[PDB]
Design a protein around this motif. Sequence first.
Motif, mmCIF file in Angstrom:
data_model
loop_
_atom_site.group_PDB
_atom_site.id
_atom_site.type_symbol
_atom_site.label_atom_id
_atom_site.label_comp_id
_atom_site.label_asym_id
_atom_site.label_seq_id
_atom_site.Cartn_x
_atom_site.Cartn_y
_atom_site.Cartn_z
ATOM 1 N N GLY F 163 0.783 -1.220 0.000
ATOM 2 C CA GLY F 163 0.000 0.000 0.000
ATOM 3 C C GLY F 163 0.818 1.273 0.000
ATOM 4 O O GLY F 163 1.970 1.299 -0.444
ATOM 5 N N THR F 164 0.219 2.353 0.512
ATOM 6 C CA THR F 164 0.926 3.632 0.572
ATOM 7 C C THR F 164 2.061 3.567 1.591
ATOM 8 O O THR F 164 1.938 2.946 2.651
ATOM 9 N N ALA F 165 3.181 4.208 1.238
ATOM 10 C CA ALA F 165 4.338 4.243 2.119
ATOM 11 C C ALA F 165 3.928 4.716 3.513
ATOM 12 O O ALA F 165 3.237 5.723 3.654
ATOM 13 N N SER F 166 4.364 3.957 4.518
ATOM 14 C CA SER F 166 3.982 4.328 5.848
ATOM 15 C C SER F 166 4.302 5.727 6.313
ATOM 16 O O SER F 166 5.387 6.243 6.061
ATOM 17 N N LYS F 167 3.310 6.292 6.995
ATOM 18 C CA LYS F 167 3.446 7.455 7.844
ATOM 19 C C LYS F 167 4.832 7.453 8.473
ATOM 20 O O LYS F 167 5.164 6.454 9.135
ATOM 21 N N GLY F 168 5.636 8.487 8.278
ATOM 22 C CA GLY F 168 6.860 8.606 9.050
ATOM 23 C C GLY F 168 7.062 10.046 9.484
ATOM 24 O O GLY F 168 6.163 10.872 9.307
ATOM 25 N N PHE F 169 8.213 10.375 10.045
ATOM 26 C CA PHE F 169 8.473 11.733 10.504
ATOM 27 C C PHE F 169 8.905 12.620 9.342
ATOM 28 O O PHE F 169 8.447 13.747 9.168
ATOM 29 N N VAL F 170 9.825 12.127 8.510
ATOM 30 C CA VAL F 170 10.312 12.995 7.430
ATOM 31 C C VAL F 170 9.291 13.135 6.301
ATOM 32 O O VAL F 170 8.471 12.246 6.065
ATOM 33 N N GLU G 42 1.726 14.675 21.503
ATOM 34 C CA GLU G 42 2.507 15.142 20.366
ATOM 35 C C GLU G 42 3.931 14.610 20.401
ATOM 36 O O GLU G 42 4.499 14.233 19.374
ATOM 37 N N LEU G 43 4.509 14.594 21.613
ATOM 38 C CA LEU G 43 5.840 14.021 21.789
ATOM 39 C C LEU G 43 5.828 12.529 21.491
ATOM 40 O O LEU G 43 6.730 12.020 20.824
ATOM 41 N N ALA G 44 4.811 11.838 21.987
ATOM 42 C CA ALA G 44 4.703 10.399 21.789
ATOM 43 C C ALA G 44 4.475 10.088 20.312
ATOM 44 O O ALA G 44 5.044 9.163 19.747
ATOM 45 N N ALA G 45 3.619 10.896 19.685
ATOM 46 C CA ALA G 45 3.295 10.687 18.272
ATOM 47 C C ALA G 45 4.570 10.814 17.446
ATOM 48 O O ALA G 45 4.912 9.897 16.702
ATOM 49 N N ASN G 46 5.266 11.932 17.588
ATOM 50 C CA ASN G 46 6.474 12.168 16.803
ATOM 51 C C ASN G 46 7.564 11.132 17.061
ATOM 52 O O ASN G 46 8.275 10.749 16.120
ATOM 53 N N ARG G 125 20.890 9.440 1.059
ATOM 54 C CA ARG G 125 19.496 9.824 1.289
ATOM 55 C C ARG G 125 19.110 9.561 2.736
ATOM 56 O O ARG G 125 18.386 10.330 3.371
ATOM 57 N N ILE G 126 19.586 8.465 3.315
ATOM 58 C CA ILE G 126 19.227 8.190 4.717
ATOM 59 C C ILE G 126 19.899 9.132 5.696
ATOM 60 O O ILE G 126 19.302 9.495 6.711
ATOM 61 N N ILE G 127 21.125 9.561 5.415
ATOM 62 C CA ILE G 127 21.789 10.546 6.263
ATOM 63 C C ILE G 127 21.004 11.850 6.306
ATOM 64 O O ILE G 127 20.942 12.495 7.362
ATOM 65 N N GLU G 128 20.404 12.243 5.179
ATOM 66 C CA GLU G 128 19.593 13.467 5.220
ATOM 67 C C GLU G 128 18.352 13.300 6.087
ATOM 68 O O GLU G 128 17.906 14.244 6.743
ATOM 69 N N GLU G 129 17.770 12.113 6.142
ATOM 70 C CA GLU G 129 16.670 11.897 7.080
ATOM 71 C C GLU G 129 17.125 11.879 8.534
ATOM 72 O O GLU G 129 16.417 12.392 9.404
ATOM 73 N N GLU G 130 18.292 11.305 8.804
ATOM 74 C CA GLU G 130 18.851 11.290 10.156
ATOM 75 C C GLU G 130 19.065 12.713 10.675
ATOM 76 O O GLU G 130 18.840 13.023 11.847
ATOM 77 N N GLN G 131 19.493 13.593 9.780
ATOM 78 C CA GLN G 131 19.667 14.999 10.097
ATOM 79 C C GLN G 131 18.340 15.616 10.502
ATOM 80 O O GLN G 131 18.263 16.432 11.424
ATOM 81 N N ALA G 132 17.246 15.248 9.829
ATOM 82 C CA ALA G 132 15.971 15.827 10.281
ATOM 83 C C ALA G 132 15.625 15.291 11.661
ATOM 84 O O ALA G 132 15.061 15.991 12.505
ATOM 85 N N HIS G 133 15.974 14.032 11.911
ATOM 86 C CA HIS G 133 15.747 13.487 13.247
ATOM 87 C C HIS G 133 16.560 14.270 14.278
ATOM 88 O O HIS G 133 16.047 14.629 15.333
ATOM 89 N N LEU G 134 17.828 14.517 13.968
ATOM 90 C CA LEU G 134 18.737 15.188 14.898
ATOM 91 C C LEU G 134 18.232 16.561 15.312
ATOM 92 O O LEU G 134 18.176 16.913 16.492
ATOM 93 N N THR G 158 -2.381 16.380 24.631
ATOM 94 C CA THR G 158 -2.613 16.550 23.185
ATOM 95 C C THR G 158 -2.890 15.216 22.495
ATOM 96 O O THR G 158 -2.646 14.136 23.051
ATOM 97 N N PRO G 159 -3.406 15.202 21.266
ATOM 98 C CA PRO G 159 -3.613 13.936 20.546
ATOM 99 C C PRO G 159 -2.316 13.162 20.337
ATOM 100 O O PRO G 159 -1.250 13.737 20.096
ATOM 101 N N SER G 160 -2.332 11.836 20.414
ATOM 102 C CA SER G 160 -1.109 11.069 20.171
ATOM 103 C C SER G 160 -1.197 10.238 18.891
ATOM 104 O O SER G 160 -0.309 9.444 18.571
ATOM 105 N N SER G 161 -2.283 10.440 18.152
ATOM 106 C CA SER G 161 -2.518 9.697 16.921
ATOM 107 C C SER G 161 -1.403 9.950 15.922
ATOM 108 O O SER G 161 -0.919 11.070 15.757
ATOM 109 N N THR G 162 -0.964 8.892 15.243
ATOM 110 C CA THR G 162 0.020 9.104 14.175
ATOM 111 C C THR G 162 -0.704 8.863 12.851
ATOM 112 O O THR G 162 -0.112 8.650 11.804
ATOM 113 N N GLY G 163 -2.027 8.908 12.974
ATOM 114 C CA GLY G 163 -2.948 8.749 11.876
ATOM 115 C C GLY G 163 -3.731 7.453 11.988
ATOM 116 O O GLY G 163 -3.991 6.936 13.078
ATOM 117 N N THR G 164 -4.098 6.941 10.819
ATOM 118 C CA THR G 164 -4.881 5.716 10.725
ATOM 119 C C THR G 164 -4.045 4.492 11.078
ATOM 120 O O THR G 164 -2.840 4.435 10.823
#
Lengths: 170, 169, 170, 169, 170, 170, 170
Positions: F163-170, G42-46, G125-134, G158-164
Amino acid sequence: GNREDRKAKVIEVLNKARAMELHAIHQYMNQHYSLDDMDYGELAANMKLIAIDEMRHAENFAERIKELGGEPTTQKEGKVVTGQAVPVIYESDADQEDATIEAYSQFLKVCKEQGDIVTARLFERIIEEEQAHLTYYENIGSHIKNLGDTYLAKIAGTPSSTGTASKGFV
Amino acid sequence: NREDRKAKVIEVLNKARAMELHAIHQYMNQHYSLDDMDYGELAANMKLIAIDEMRHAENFAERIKELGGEPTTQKEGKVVTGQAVPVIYESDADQEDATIEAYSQFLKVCKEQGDIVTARLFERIIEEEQAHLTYYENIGSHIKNLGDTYLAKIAGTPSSTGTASKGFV
Amino acid sequence: GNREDRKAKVIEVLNKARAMELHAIHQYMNQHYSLDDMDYGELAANMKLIAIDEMRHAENFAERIKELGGEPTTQKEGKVVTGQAVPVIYESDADQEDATIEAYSQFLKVCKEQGDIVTARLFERIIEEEQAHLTYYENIGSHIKNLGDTYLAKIAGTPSSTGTASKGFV
Amino acid sequence: NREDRKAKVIEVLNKARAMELHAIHQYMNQHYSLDDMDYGELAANMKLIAIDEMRHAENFAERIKELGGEPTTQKEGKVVTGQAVPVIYESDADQEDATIEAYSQFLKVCKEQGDIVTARLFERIIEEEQAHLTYYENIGSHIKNLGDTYLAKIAGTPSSTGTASKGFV
Amino acid sequence: GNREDRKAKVIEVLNKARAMELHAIHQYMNQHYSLDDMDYGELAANMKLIAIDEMRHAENFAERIKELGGEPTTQKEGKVVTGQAVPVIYESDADQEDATIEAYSQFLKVCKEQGDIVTARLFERIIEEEQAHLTYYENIGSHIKNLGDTYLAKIAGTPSSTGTASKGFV
Amino acid sequence: GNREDRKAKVIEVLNKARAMELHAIHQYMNQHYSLDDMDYGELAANMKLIAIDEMRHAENFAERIKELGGEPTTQKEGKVVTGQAVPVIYESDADQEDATIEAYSQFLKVCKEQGDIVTARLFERIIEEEQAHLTYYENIGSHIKNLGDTYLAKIAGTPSSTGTASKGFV
Amino acid sequence: GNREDRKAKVIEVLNKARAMELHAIHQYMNQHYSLDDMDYGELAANMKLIAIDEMRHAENFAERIKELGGEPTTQKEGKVVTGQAVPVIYESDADQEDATIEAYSQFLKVCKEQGDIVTARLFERIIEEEQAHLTYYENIGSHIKNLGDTYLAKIAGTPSSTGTASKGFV
Ligand code: FEC
Ligand code: FEC
Ligand code: FEC
Ligand SMILES: [Fe+3]
Ligand SMILES: [Fe+3]
Ligand SMILES: [Fe+3]
Ligand SMILES: [Fe+3]
Ligand SMILES: [Fe+3]
Ligand SMILES: [Fe+3]
Ligand SMILES: [Fe+3]
Ligand SMILES: [Fe+3]
Ligand SMILES: [Fe+3]
Ligand SMILES: [Fe+3]
Ligand SMILES: [Fe+3]
Ligand SMILES: [Fe+3]
Ligand SMILES: [Fe+3]
Ligand SMILES: [Fe+3]
């Protein structure tokens, strides 16, 4: 267990094995009649020769059942499938032989648990012959699946003789 | 109609074939008993008669295929087990005589359906059945008249029916 | 060189050749087990017969090595390739026989340079046998490439016997 | 279940086959030595035993293919060269003994995995290894105990193992 | 246990088996002499032929014992009963063969337990031959029971020969 | 026992369960990478979707453990088997699911025994999902057995998307 | 190096990277269970959304490992620290992300040295995502250090939903 309970339990798997043989005899001879009707002689002849192996198996099981004081069954296990096309004949027989070897290995185990070495050796010998059938059926099935018409054109019109007529009374 | 004619012959052929499969099982069950009792010559001829019945079943099946039909795989009636030696020969004579009566009726159906090849098949097999009948009547009569004197002669005789038959392995 | 130096240079190409034979034996028998498994009898039998030629070569090379006072190697040269499909068996086998004859023809030159007539005759003899293997593999590869399954369908179910069971001790 | 049992049998089959591949090279190496020494009867029987091990290797490979696996091409262990006559027979008797001990365990796996055909294969081969073992024990004892009159009897005897084997050319 | 302990345990069952064979040899030959004295030729002959089977069993057990570094016993297990009437001969011999098959089946398990495959196979083969002896003795005993003198009248005066005189030194 | 005793006993089986889910995630994803590598799309996709089910189980277990004030484990129970072939994948996955249901059924009984209704319901709902997984693995293993390459050919090249790529942070 | 050597050295740093991801999934999801228990949605969701990014990283590393003929590790790298307090969560995750980026930059170098351009771009490409995490972890960490309970008061409830609910099998 006591002496009579060990025989009873062994007679039970022998009769299950014999009922399987009775089925195989009718099943493989049914296919032999079609193969012959189709004029694929080499296949028809080998099918009949394997059915005669099963007849011998059924006879050896019965003989052992008598040695142990039991009554050899006259009923086949399962239903015979008729009207199968060539590819289906070999597909089904391979599966059948593979199922038989698995079942007989289990019966062999029961004989060893009942301390019946003579019966276990009988299953051992017959399982090795079932392996030769299985290998035969798997090889034919593969050639049909993979080579089609050129393979069958080679078999078309070949001799279907299985040798001099059976000893009988008349 | 042609199709009509074929169907009726295939039917009596399958009825006959069903009787042959019964006979094979019935006779081999008696063979297992006679062998177990160590009456070798009796066991051996019983098995040789069973093999003639196997050949009949096969000849019937082959003609059914020539007529476009499907050879039955089921035997007619039930096998009687645990028969005493006099009962074996008495009931087998009875069965052979009944088989000849039935096949003689099947043959007439073949003649009525204009099937000469199949009627000839019945005729040849009926003559083998008569040989079987005579055999069973003769043994029954020896057992009747001579009893244990006759048993004593067969006790411990060879049970061999010859070379093991042709197989795949 | 001197005598010992001459022998040493010849034992070295003999051991390289022997190592090539040890590889061929394992490679051809590996393909044999596959061809047998596929039930292409004629192909399976001939592959095994060629492997036996390679066994004899290995033995002859070892005997000469001993005659020369050396030690016959026990290691095969190169790795055996497994799981090859039929067209790949014949194309790689022809490649290998071809390379073998090239290498042995250079080994043969060494023998001549070292004044070893008996060893040179051994290589000449064996090179002729490699040529026979080469021609065989080329022809099978060509029929497979030109006629595919129409050709293979004719090998299917053919006898695979290479003859009487091997002389052995038991 | 079926697939795990099958996997476990293929593994012991390839272990045994790798032991055969070792035996073939080891014994043929000693055969070359015995022949070079001109002890013909000892040379001939060594090669004949090596041909039994070839047969074993082949039978293991055929069964492995039957089970869907790939027969190994690597020998188990290192081959020892330059062995003197006494060491040849001491070491070969010890190898055959360990082989029997290892195959008896492989056999047990086969029984445990319900593989009757493979278990009987190991049973037949173990009987042949026992014949090899006895032979090497006997030769070792004559060499240890009967000195030069025993070697002089062997000296110069025929080393032929029969006609040159069936090949392609 | 260790190599030594495993061999000792198998040699122990092998010598118990051999001792039973030595007893069977003397027991059956004693009966042979009575039957031959009574001029029941076919019965005397088959009894001696079975004794010669037990002789071969004792020898095979001894050979294996030697192979395992043990000493084959020379003592029979049990007493020989003499002067048995014909019905007692076949009743006691059937019971004896039955007891032997039970015993040997326990000895076989010891072999497998000691991981002695060669010896297990020896016991398996011999057990099959004991089963042929058992079947023979039950059959004769049943004819004597069911037919009596009528059956023996048939055996009286038959040939007692077991063939050509057995190989020897002089 | 007392209240904290009852929570502690429940947190214990919940972490055992969680450790089993963590194992299942790594084991089924390992197989997913194989199936994807093999290009059996539909099989690869459904293996990954069952793994995501196990992740949800792991999460649910952790959430409950937190509600009872415990600490959710981070270690899986047992080792992950790699290099499994397709017939072995489905055979072991069925056995694994069967064992899970067996295990969770016992854990649920502890929950009832400790008077923890909320956790018992959690085990009940997840066991119903494991049964769906078990039925699935049994079905594929049956098709692979009975239909072999004909079934794999239908799967060959199928889409592997979940399906659709999972929900992530980035 | 040769082709296989180059692949093996790249497979080696890919499995190292994968082991780090497997660690990060367990470590961050452990923190998520704490943040949710504390009802900081929000913290838990992220946190969960970032763990899902690491799940996709671990998946991409394994698919590339499979592409190069290797076996994806199932072992996580390092110890997961459980029970961490909120100030400690964010300081540790930021240090972990910066170490990952330093480590992946070195792995990237290996790929370039082994001539693996496709694998180098994967790391890139993964290092650029790690940077957003950092950056995320550095920012939350700073708000918790500098504003404390005033900032957390905003997150409480706050809501903790990460969606569906993610797609699964059942
Ligand atoms: C045809 C045919 C059928 C019918 C099947 C059908 O569905 O039409 C047929 C059916 C059966 C059936 C049941 C049995 C099992 C009997 C029982 O155990 O109750 C059954 C049993 C035996 N058959 Fe049989 N048959 N049959 C042949 C043909 C057919 N046979 C031919 C030919 C030979 C030739 C053997 C030879 O020459 O060595 C042959 C021999 C035997 C032997 C003899 C074994 C020996 O002494 O080695 C036994 C026992
Ligand atoms: C020489 C020599 C070597 C070299 C080994 C070395 O280390 O120098 C040598 C090596 C091997 C090696 C490996 C194998 C194992 C093949 C495999 O399973 O992959 C291997 C395998 C076989 N050999 Fe072999 N050999 N070899 C002979 C001589 C040598 N052989 C002679 C002679 C005969 C006699 C042919 C006959 O009469 O059947 C013979 C027969 C066979 C058969 C056929 C058995 C049968 O059909 O019953 C098989 C299989
Ligand atoms: C890939 C991969 C791995 C690595 C395994 C490996 O061995 O390579 C992997 C590993 C794990 C592991 C451990 C856990 C357990 C964490 C814990 O409880 O400590 C773990 C936990 C979760 N994963 Fe996971 N993963 N994962 C996905 C891919 C992978 N995942 C994809 C894709 C989705 C897609 C989300 C969806 O659409 O449902 C997804 C979702 C979740 C959810 C969210 C469930 C929900 O909210 O409904 C949880 C919890
Ligand atoms: Fe059978
Ligand atoms: Fe069969
Ligand atoms: Fe009839
Ligand atoms: Fe009749
Ligand atoms: Fe060569
Ligand atoms: Fe060559
Ligand atoms: Fe061997
Ligand atoms: Fe050996
Ligand atoms: Fe005995
Ligand atoms: Fe005896
Ligand atoms: Fe689960
Ligand atoms: Fe599950
Ligand atoms: Fe990451
Ligand atoms: Fe990260």
